[PDB]
Each structure stands twice: as C-alpha cells, then as structure tokens.
Amino acid sequence: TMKVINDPIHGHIELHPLLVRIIDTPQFQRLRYIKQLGGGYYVFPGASHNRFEHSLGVGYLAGCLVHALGEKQPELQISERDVLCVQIAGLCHDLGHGPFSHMFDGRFIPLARPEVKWTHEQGSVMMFEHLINSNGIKPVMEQYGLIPEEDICFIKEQIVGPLLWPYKGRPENKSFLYEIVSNKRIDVAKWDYFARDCHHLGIQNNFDYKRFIKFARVCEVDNELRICARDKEVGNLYDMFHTRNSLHRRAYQHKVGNIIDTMITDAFLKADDYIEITGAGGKKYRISTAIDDMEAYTKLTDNIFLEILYSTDPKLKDAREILKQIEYRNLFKYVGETQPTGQIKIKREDYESLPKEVASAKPKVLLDVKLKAEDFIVDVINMDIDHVSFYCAEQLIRVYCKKVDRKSLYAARQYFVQWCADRNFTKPQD
Amino acid sequence: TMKVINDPIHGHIELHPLLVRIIDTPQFQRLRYIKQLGGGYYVFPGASHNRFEHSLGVGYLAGCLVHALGEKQPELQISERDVLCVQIAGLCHDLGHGPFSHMFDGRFIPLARPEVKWTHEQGSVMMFEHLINSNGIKPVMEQYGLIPEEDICFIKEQIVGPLLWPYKGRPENKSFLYEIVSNNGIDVAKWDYFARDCHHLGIQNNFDYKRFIKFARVCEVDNELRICARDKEVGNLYDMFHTRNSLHRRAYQHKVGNIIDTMITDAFLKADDYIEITGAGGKKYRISTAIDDMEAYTKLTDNIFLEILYSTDPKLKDAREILKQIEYRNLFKYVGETQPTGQIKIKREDYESLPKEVASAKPKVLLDVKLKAEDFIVDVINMDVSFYCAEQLIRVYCKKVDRKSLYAARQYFVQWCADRNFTKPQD
DNA sequence: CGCC
DNA sequence: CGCC
Ligand SMILES: [Zn+2]
Ligand SMILES: [Zn+2]
C-alpha cells in the first residue's frame, strides 16, 4: 500500500512512503517553479514542463532499473534498502537547479561571479541536506530501514561524484549502483528527459527504455562491475544517440532559444544588485549570492523573471526593459558561430572576458560606428557509444549583438571574424 | 511565407503576420503565466501547460475550419478578412483569464466581491481592446485588409456574444462564423483543450478533429445557416463526448485538485487587502479589483501565488501559511458531496453565505466538538448538432482534519442538505 | 488521499 | 527568425 502519481510518460508512478515525505517539502516542491528547458519555452510553447515532474520520472526510472537488476541477479546483494537510496538519488539529483535550469549555473553565475565554482549538482547536495534537516527526515529514514549516515552520503555520492576506491557510501562490490542515476563516464536521467522533452517538443523518440531495462544485466570489464545490455539492443542504442542528437540540434542548441537565455541572463545581471531574497536570520541575499544560503535559494525560482518584469522599482528599469523586449520579440541578433580548435575548451571563469576580447579586435576595414564590449554577447554552448559494454562539436561559440541596425550588425560581424582569426578558431560561414 | 510555431498537438502552426503582431504583445504573452488547469497541476504533474499554447491552438483550428468551409462552399462569400477575424477571435478568447483560470472568475471573485458580475470572457473583450490600443494594432489591421470598427466588434462578439439578429459585426448570411470560436457546445476551443489536456494528462483522445473539419459544411436548419457534419461521423462525436466525460470525472472535477483550488482561493482572500498591483497612472489595485484596470490585470497571473509564498510581510502570513500547507501536503479534507436535484441552483451571489449555513445547521444529535464557519469550504461545481445526408455539484471540505472535527463536520453537512432539501450524502 |  |  503506497501512493501513486499519474505521469503522462510513465503512467502510474508508485512512491514508497519515505519518498513521499521527501517530495512533500518546500525544497522539493520548489522544482515546480523552474522550467526544464529554461528559455526554450519561448520557442517551443509545448515545453512548459518543470524539473518537478522530471525528477519524479528519474526517481521512478532509477528504482525500476535496480529492482530489475536485483531480481534478475540476486547474487548481487541488492537490498531493497539499496533501491530506496537509488530512488532518492534520482528524485533529488536536480534539487540544486536555479532559475531556468542550465542557464543559471551554466551562464549567469559564471558571469556574475567568475570566481566561485558552482554547479547545480553541488546545489543538490546542499539543498538535499537542507531538505533532510529542516523536515526531520533522518528519523523517518531509519524507520523504513535505511542507515542514515552511510546512506545519506551514498545519496550525495550518486548526485555529485567522488571526493583505488573513491566512494564511501557503498563498497566496491556494489560499484554498479553508482552508474544508474548519473553515469558521467547513459543514466536514467537522460532516459526520462529524452522521452519527456520530445513529448513536449513534438520530436519522436525511438529509444525504448523499458526494453533496455528488461535486457540489462551487470557484467564484468576491467574486473569492475558495470551495467550492460544485450547485443539485441544495439539498434535501440543507435536510436538513443540519434534522438539525443536531434534534441540538441533542434531544441537545446536552438538559435533563438539560446539567444533568449542570454537575454534573461542579461536582465538578471542588471537586476542583481537591487534584488533581495531573505535567507537565514533575515540576511538578505541577491540572485548571484542566493546559492550560498539554502533558505534563500529555496525562494529563487523562475518567479524572479516575473518579479523583475512586474516591478515598479526605478532601480530595476534596465533589467525590466530587457525582459520587456522579449515580450515584444525584439531580441539580440545572431552574428555568427565558431568552435575552438583541437580539444581546447573555454572555461566559465573566462566567460566574462569574452565580449571584451571581441571588441578589442581590429578588423580589416574601418567603419564609422565602433562597438564596445557591452554591445556583444558571447555564448558558449557545450553539449556536455563505444564505452557501452555489452554481453550476449562538443563546444560551440556563438556571438550576438544588442544593436540591431544593419550598420552595427555588419560591424559586429567584422569583430567576430577578427576574434576567430586571433584565437585561431574555425572560420565562420554564412 | 510566414512565421511558424511548432506545436506538440498540431505540428506546425503558420501564423499570418497580423496574428504575430498581437501575440508578441505583453497582453498576450501574459497567458504564458496562467496554468490551463489551475491547481490540477498539483495533482497531475504532466499538466504544466498554460493558456498561451492553448490559445495558439484555438487560433489555428479556428482558421483551419473556416478556411475549409470557404474552400468547399465559395457561395458563402468568406473573405480573408473573415478568416483573419475568426483567427483573432480564437487567439484572444482567453485573454481575460486570471490566475489559475476558472478558479479566478468561478470562485475567487464571487467570494471576494459577490456584488460584481464578472466573467473571463468580459475580461477577454476588455483585455483585447487594451492590447489593440497599447500596441498600435489598428493600423496593422488596416494593412491587411481589415476594417477596424466592424471587424473589432466582430471579434468581441465571437468572444463574449451579442448585446431577430443581435450581432453588429457580421450579417446573417454569415451566421455560421459565430459558431466557430465559442458556441451547442462544440467549438474549436474545446477541440484543442480536449487534445491538449489529454496529451499532458496521459488520457487518451481518439476524437479526430481533422476529419470532422474535412467532412463539415454549413447547412440550412430552421431558418438558419449553421455548421453541420456528415451523419457519417456520429461515431467520431460519440468518442469526443466520451473523452469529455473522461476529462471531467478524472481531471477537471478531481477531488484533491478541487480542494487545492479552494486552498489557493483561501490564500488569495486572506492576501487580498495587502497585495498591491500598480495600474494606469501609478494607481494601486488589489487581487480582487485588478479586473477593473487592464494595465494592472496584465501583471496578475499565477505569479501572485509565489509572491504570497515568498513574502516576508507580516500582514501576509495568514495567506502565506495556507500556501505552505499546500507544499507540506496538509490539505483541507473532503467532507461530502451533494446535489440540488429538484431545486433552485446555488448562485455565485450566495457563495459567501454557504459556510455560515453549514456551521449553523446542527443535527438532533449533539457532540462535544463544535465548528465555526471559517472551518468550512463549500465548493460549487457547475457543469454548464445538425447533420445532413449532474448540472450542479456541491462539495464541502473542512479545514480541521483531526478525527473528531471531521466527524462533526460530516454531521453539519448531512443536516445542511436536509435543511436545503439536497440529496442525502452517501458513503 | 497526486490510483477515480 | 518560436520552420532547422
Ligand atoms: Zn535531470
Ligand atoms: Zn479556451
């Protein structure tokens, strides 16, 4: 006797009582107010979904994979305690996302605070412990057969990775369990958001996850235990990689969608000094420092968009006038694309310095109106098959300009070509 | 070649440039921030959709059907102007919705101001005219061949209805055009949200609108030009009505979803005196009076939920703590259901008085625990073809959820339905 | 009662 | 450039 939540992707999702008492907290329900695809909704109107229902799907998928593993191979000693912590890990892996998901830690906090190293996964670890303490979950955890001190750290390890054996939460015989929720070397997170995102985007999904689950086993490579699929399933995995490619080309890397993300990020930056969120002890925080106090971060969601847009505050009129140009669909303009040469990749610490480098370049022929750094938006688009074990351009740089007259736009495209020449990046096309 | 919006229900939606220039206004994009099912999202997580994408679907379908009618029967004199005005009517039928959709005008405003008579359709008319003047749409209309005065009133009439022939926007040789956007109860708006809601709820819809449009035509019935389908497709409509029945019993009238709607309304009522929305000329409005100025109403959306939830103001803690019991899933509890069979139905004007009645009734059998009116919620759920070859439910919830309060509440409910001659509640 |  |  356990609770059921109806889901359009997975149908009925049965929830162990302990999962229910993690979901029914303000820290988890927070995910109802953060859109999964960020500003992609302003391009795909079917993409209204938030991290909340996605994380229900990931928790469900995680639990159905290891319970299927434990029933096909009982020799692997998979307690139902192990299933409860894998389910909790999938449920909370996204707890640390901020407004508009990957826009927040992928762009905004790099540009507002290049010094800090911040990821949503660290956010999830912090928010997970804030969730556990504020709602008295540690007693409820042992009541359902979990050992909190070792099992909370097991949960945290599944979300954020390691600190021979780097993991303290599970022994090395249960190594396979760490490949389920987030495998950073195919995980149940991409299973859900591949199906969910195409459902809302109108893209077809030819990956069948339930057919991957039923024929999946744990095999041995390296003397290490891994999750492995049948030779009969390579056609399915060719499909998994194809829809991942179409989701990226068509949605995640959409040209208009990515510009709008950087427009929202611009409005946050110009609002960052004047917006206050009350955290612990009345301490007031800002959008960029809310990540330092979880009580404030809990109230940092996509709501900050509408609060800026609905504001009367005169100090917020630069930010408010950017969000208002999104409604009028007068956006930054697409100058061009380029990719870093070799395996070299740009780093978040240097994002802020990118528009100043482009303005400093000297093009071949002079034009009267000259551009400064603030006329440029430099957009760094990162994406992140034979590592799959059976048995029987990763970075894009796009440049936009906030000037939309034809003479500014030509000039902007001659500071982009020179910048590429200077850094020896691939030459832009048309 | 024109702008294209990819939609999960309809695929590609081509939009006339004029439609693009009303969509890309703050008054229309406002619908991105109003959930289609209101609080149903707190029960069905797939139901994250908003009025914006629904209204895109209605403008598309409206133009599809009218273009199909003019293509099969050119005798009917259907110009571009008529289809552009039918499309605009479909796009803007829902402009007047408030936070959480039907909750706002169906419950909140009756309880916050039982005096005034308000509907979202009157809102859509008011907001449509605010959209047109603030965004300089009247010249753009002229550009594409529209006559503003008669074509704007034609659009308003399609939304909210008229004031022999009651309509001033089109003659009766074009009588059929008023049957498309809002109606029999078969309009292109219910086609979209049946498909859209079932897509996001996981309910299955096998009603085919695309072939109902293809075999539809206008016909003569009792002195009148009306839209008609082949008697061939009674089978298509039997399925449409089944999915309407499924969406109502399973989703629209869900017991917990409706309880949460009345919890959100309760927090709105307790926040209504302390929330300020700035309208035209800096003039400040409240949640219940923002409907009086469209410049303020533009900024009244579901965001107001999170403004209450994230507030520090001490005057907003009664409201904030109701929304906090939604997050903790400690909700009002279901006491019972009844119907006024055989009786004058409850009216929005009487809504406020209903809890005081329930708490004033008390059976021949007394018990120790005794409730007051604010401990009760009274929820009034209202339900509301030519071919060619339970009206009202009242549910009662209690805000005290201990076993002894709930037992009493169920004995004030059983005796309030004998006092009102409503049907006896069953178990 | 995020199962009608 | 809410079509890739
Ligand atoms: Zn995820
Ligand atoms: Zn509608």
Numbering used by the authors:
A (entry chain D): 114 to 276, 284 to 305, 308 to 506, 515 to 522, 546 to 583
B (entry chain A): 114 to 276, 284 to 303, 306 to 506, 518 to 522, 546 to 583
Task: Please give the exact wording used by the authors of the publication that reports this structure.
Identification of SAMHD1 as the factor that impedes infection of myeloid cells by HIV and SIV brought to light an intrinsic cellular antiviral immunity mechanism that relies on controlled reduction of deoxynucleotide triphosphate (dNTP) availability. Collectively, our results shed new light onto the intricate allosteric regulation of SAMHD1 activity and raise questions about the role of nucleic acid phosphorothioation in dNTP metabolism and antiviral immunity in bacteria and in humans.
To gain further mechanistic insight into the interaction of SAMHD1 with nucleic acids, we determined structures of SAMHD1114–626 bound to the phosphorothioate-linked deoxy(C*G*C*C*T) and the phosphodiester-linked ribo(CGCCU) oligonucleotides by X-ray crystallography. In contrast, in our oligonucleotide-bound structures, only the dimer-1 interface is intact, but the packing of the two SAMHD1 dimers in the asymmetric unit is looser, the dimer-2 (tetramer) interface is not properly formed, and no 222-point symmetry is present. For example, the guanine nucleobase of the sole G nucleotide within the oligos is accommodated in the guanine-recognition pocket of the A1 formed by SAMHD1 residues D137, Q142, R145, and R451. The key difference between the oligonucleotide-bound and nucleotide-triphosphate-bound structures is that in the nucleotide-triphosphate-bound tetramer, the allosteric ligands in the A1 and A2 sites make contacts with residues of three distinct monomers, whereas in our oligonucleotide-bound structures, residues of only two monomers are involved. In the d(C*G*C*C*T)-bound structure, histidine H376 appears to form a hydrogen bond with one of the nonbridging atoms of the phosphorothioate linkage between the G2 and C3 nucleotides in the oligo.
